[PDB]
Scaffold this active site. Structure first.
Site, PDB file in Angstrom:
ATOM      1  N   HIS A 124       0.804  -1.217   0.000  1.00  0.00           N
ATOM      2  CA  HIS A 124       0.000   0.000   0.000  1.00  0.00           C
ATOM      3  C   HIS A 124       0.836   1.266   0.000  1.00  0.00           C
ATOM      4  O   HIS A 124       0.361   2.330  -0.380  1.00  0.00           O
ATOM      5  CB  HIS A 124      -1.041  -0.016   1.129  1.00  0.00           C
ATOM      6  CG  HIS A 124      -0.514   0.426   2.491  1.00  0.00           C
ATOM      7  ND1 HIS A 124      -0.349  -0.434   3.523  1.00  0.00           N
ATOM      8  CD2 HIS A 124      -0.151   1.679   2.960  1.00  0.00           C
ATOM      9  CE1 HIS A 124       0.074   0.239   4.599  1.00  0.00           C
ATOM     10  NE2 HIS A 124       0.216   1.538   4.258  1.00  0.00           N
ATOM     11  N   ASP A 139      -0.751  -7.348   1.672  1.00  0.00           N
ATOM     12  CA  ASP A 139      -0.166  -6.011   1.704  1.00  0.00           C
ATOM     13  C   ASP A 139       1.363  -6.053   1.870  1.00  0.00           C
ATOM     14  O   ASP A 139       1.900  -5.607   2.873  1.00  0.00           O
ATOM     15  CB  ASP A 139      -0.814  -5.196   2.821  1.00  0.00           C
ATOM     16  CG  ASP A 139      -0.425  -3.738   2.773  1.00  0.00           C
ATOM     17  OD1 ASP A 139       0.167  -3.312   1.751  1.00  0.00           O
ATOM     18  OD2 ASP A 139      -0.657  -3.015   3.752  1.00  0.00           O
ATOM     19  N   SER A 181       3.947   1.635   8.273  1.00  0.00           N
ATOM     20  CA  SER A 181       3.682   0.524   7.367  1.00  0.00           C
ATOM     21  C   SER A 181       4.912  -0.036   6.724  1.00  0.00           C
ATOM     22  O   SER A 181       5.828   0.703   6.381  1.00  0.00           O
ATOM     23  CB  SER A 181       2.738   0.950   6.262  1.00  0.00           C
ATOM     24  OG  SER A 181       1.480   1.215   6.822  1.00  0.00           O
TER      25      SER A 181
HETATM   26  C1  LIG Z   1       0.539   2.736   5.126  1.00  0.00           C
HETATM   27  C2  LIG Z   1       0.917   2.490   6.605  1.00  0.00           C
HETATM   28  O1  LIG Z   1       1.793   3.533   6.960  1.00  0.00           O
HETATM   29  C3  LIG Z   1      -0.367   2.687   7.440  1.00  0.00           C
HETATM   30  C4  LIG Z   1      -0.074   2.280   8.910  1.00  0.00           C
HETATM   31  C5  LIG Z   1      -1.322   2.234   9.797  1.00  0.00           C
HETATM   32  C6  LIG Z   1      -2.056   3.577   9.868  1.00  0.00           C
HETATM   33  N1  LIG Z   1      -3.094   3.452  10.903  1.00  0.00           N
HETATM   34  C7  LIG Z   1      -3.897   4.506  11.254  1.00  0.00           C
HETATM   35  N2  LIG Z   1      -3.660   5.735  10.708  1.00  0.00           N
HETATM   36  N3  LIG Z   1      -4.884   4.355  12.113  1.00  0.00           N
HETATM   37  N4  LIG Z   1      -1.461   1.868   6.896  1.00  0.00           N
HETATM   38  C8  LIG Z   1      -2.597   2.409   6.375  1.00  0.00           C
HETATM   39  O2  LIG Z   1      -2.738   3.619   6.343  1.00  0.00           O
HETATM   40  C9  LIG Z   1      -3.629   1.447   5.846  1.00  0.00           C
HETATM   41  C10 LIG Z   1      -3.469   1.450   4.336  1.00  0.00           C
HETATM   42  C11 LIG Z   1      -3.899   0.162   3.656  1.00  0.00           C
HETATM   43  C12 LIG Z   1      -4.565   0.243   2.430  1.00  0.00           C
HETATM   44  C13 LIG Z   1      -4.957  -0.900   1.744  1.00  0.00           C
HETATM   45  C14 LIG Z   1      -4.695  -2.155   2.278  1.00  0.00           C
HETATM   46  C15 LIG Z   1      -4.027  -2.257   3.493  1.00  0.00           C
HETATM   47  C16 LIG Z   1      -3.631  -1.111   4.165  1.00  0.00           C
HETATM   48  N5  LIG Z   1      -4.984   1.894   6.193  1.00  0.00           N
HETATM   49  C17 LIG Z   1      -5.392   2.011   7.457  1.00  0.00           C
HETATM   50  O3  LIG Z   1      -4.659   1.729   8.423  1.00  0.00           O
HETATM   51  C18 LIG Z   1      -6.787   2.499   7.745  1.00  0.00           C
HETATM   52  N6  LIG Z   1      -6.697   3.417   8.879  1.00  0.00           N
HETATM   53  C19 LIG Z   1      -7.462   3.329   6.639  1.00  0.00           C
HETATM   54  C20 LIG Z   1      -7.248   3.074   5.160  1.00  0.00           C
HETATM   55  C21 LIG Z   1      -6.487   3.976   4.415  1.00  0.00           C
HETATM   56  C22 LIG Z   1      -6.288   3.781   3.056  1.00  0.00           C
HETATM   57  C23 LIG Z   1      -6.875   2.688   2.431  1.00  0.00           C
HETATM   58  C24 LIG Z   1      -7.649   1.793   3.163  1.00  0.00           C
HETATM   59  C25 LIG Z   1      -7.843   1.987   4.525  1.00  0.00           C
END
Ligand SMILES: *C[C@@](*)(O)[C@H](CCCNC(=N)N)NC(=O)[C@H](Cc1ccccc1)NC(=O)[C@@H](N)Cc1ccccc1
Ligand SMILES: *[C@@H]1O[C@H](CO[C@@H]2O[C@@H](C)[C@@H](O)[C@@H](O)[C@@H]2O)[C@@H](O)[C@H](O)[C@H]1NC(C)=O
Ligand SMILES: *[C@@H]1O[C@H](CO)[C@@H](O)[C@H](O)[C@H]1NC(C)=O
Ligand SMILES: [Cl-]
Length: 233
Positions: free
Chosen positions: A41, A89, A185
């Site tokens: 992601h 992911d 992430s």
């Molecule tokens: C990308 C990485 O830095 C991030 C860490 C966790 C962030 N957590 C919070 N802000 N609460 N991950 C994400 O932002 C993650 C992206 C994702 C997209 C598609 C598949 C897997 C992971 N999304 C989340 O943690 C969710 N809070 C929201 C979200 C954002 C974008 C797309 C889908 C969901």
């Protein structure tokens, strides 16, 4: 990282920062001298040519003597990573050069090809340069939190049934929120000196026990990781 502490500089020498346009965006870890594992992601809609991978770092805003910076020769996203789903992911970055391994730059081992995911309660650690609060506060350098593997059935119920078999979760060891946040992430969940998880997603509030931190269960992807590496070696 939420509810963590600043590590001793260069004490987690496998940690990588993925930066776009000079700005830290995601974590990762050094698997081999030319290979970094991160989260798929992190690269969505990104011009790879604006990306750099920084190894040997503690304070990312300083040109530290131990830093080694590389471009990305090739990104390989898991073939089953897709929109409209959260699974798989994970990606590999083939660097445009080989890290020189030393006190500040080293490898992290994957779980074995036959290994299971860690049992509930297993003590692990997660490190990163992501936010330290829900107000987008930056850390002073690499941070790490202590967390424990959460029963996958308990995690799945908290996520209202949306978890898959290749996801694993954590909780804090105590009453404080402890876990990851945005821009953590792709960093590893390290249990018994193995990368058992990769930071993937969580809920509206970072570290909220109502929405347990979800990691890619790395053992499910070990075969694929090595296939990709061998393929371009
Ligand atoms: C990308 C990485 O830095 C991030 C860490 C966790 C962030 N957590 C919070 N802000 N609460 N991950 C994400 O932002 C993650 C992206 C994702 C997209 C598609 C598949 C897997 C992971 N999304 C989340 O943690 C969710 N809070 C929201 C979200 C954002 C974008 C797309 C889908 C969901
Ligand atoms: C995760 O759990 C899913 C079911 O979730 C539960 O049942 C639904 C109907 C809702 O009531 C929800 O709130 C409950 O938590 C299963 O379908 C799924 O297979 C499970 N996944 C794994 C990996 O165990
Ligand atoms: C690796 O890539 C980066 C940016 O894409 C570049 O600055 C660097 O010079 C490259 N290294 C080599 C050896 O080509
Ligand atoms: Cl290599």
């Amino acid at each position: 990282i939420i509810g963590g502490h600043e590590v001793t500089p260069h004490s987690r020498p496998y940690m990588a920062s993925v930066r776009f346009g000079g700005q830290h965006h995601c974590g990762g870890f050094l698997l081999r001298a030319r290979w970094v594992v991160s989260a798929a992601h992190c690269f969505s809609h990104r011009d790879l040519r604006t990306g750099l991978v920084v190894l040997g770092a503690h304070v990312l805003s300083t040109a530290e003597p131990t830093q080694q910076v590389f471009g990305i020769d090739a990104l390989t996203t898991h073939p089953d990573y897709h929109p409209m789903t959260h699974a798989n992911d994970i990606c590999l970055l083939r660097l445009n050069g080989s890290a020189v391994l030393g006190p500040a730059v080293g490898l992290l081992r994957l779980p074995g090809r036959r290994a299971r995911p860690p049992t509930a309660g297993t003590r692990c650690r997660v490190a990163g340069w992501g936010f330290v609060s829900d107000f987008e506060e930056l850390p002073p350098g690499l941070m790490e939190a202590k967390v424990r593997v959460l029963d996958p059935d308990v995690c799945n119920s908290s996520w209202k049934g949306h978890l898959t078999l290749t996801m694993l979760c954590t909780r804090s060891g105590d009453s404080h929120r402890r876990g990851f946040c945005s821009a953590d992430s792709g960093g590893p969940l390290v249990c018994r000196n193995r990368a058992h998880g990769l930071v993937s997603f969580s809920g509206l509030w970072c570290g909220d026990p109502k929405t347990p931190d979800v990691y890619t269960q790395v053992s499910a992807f070990v075969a694929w990781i090595w296939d990709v590496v061998r393929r371009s070696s």
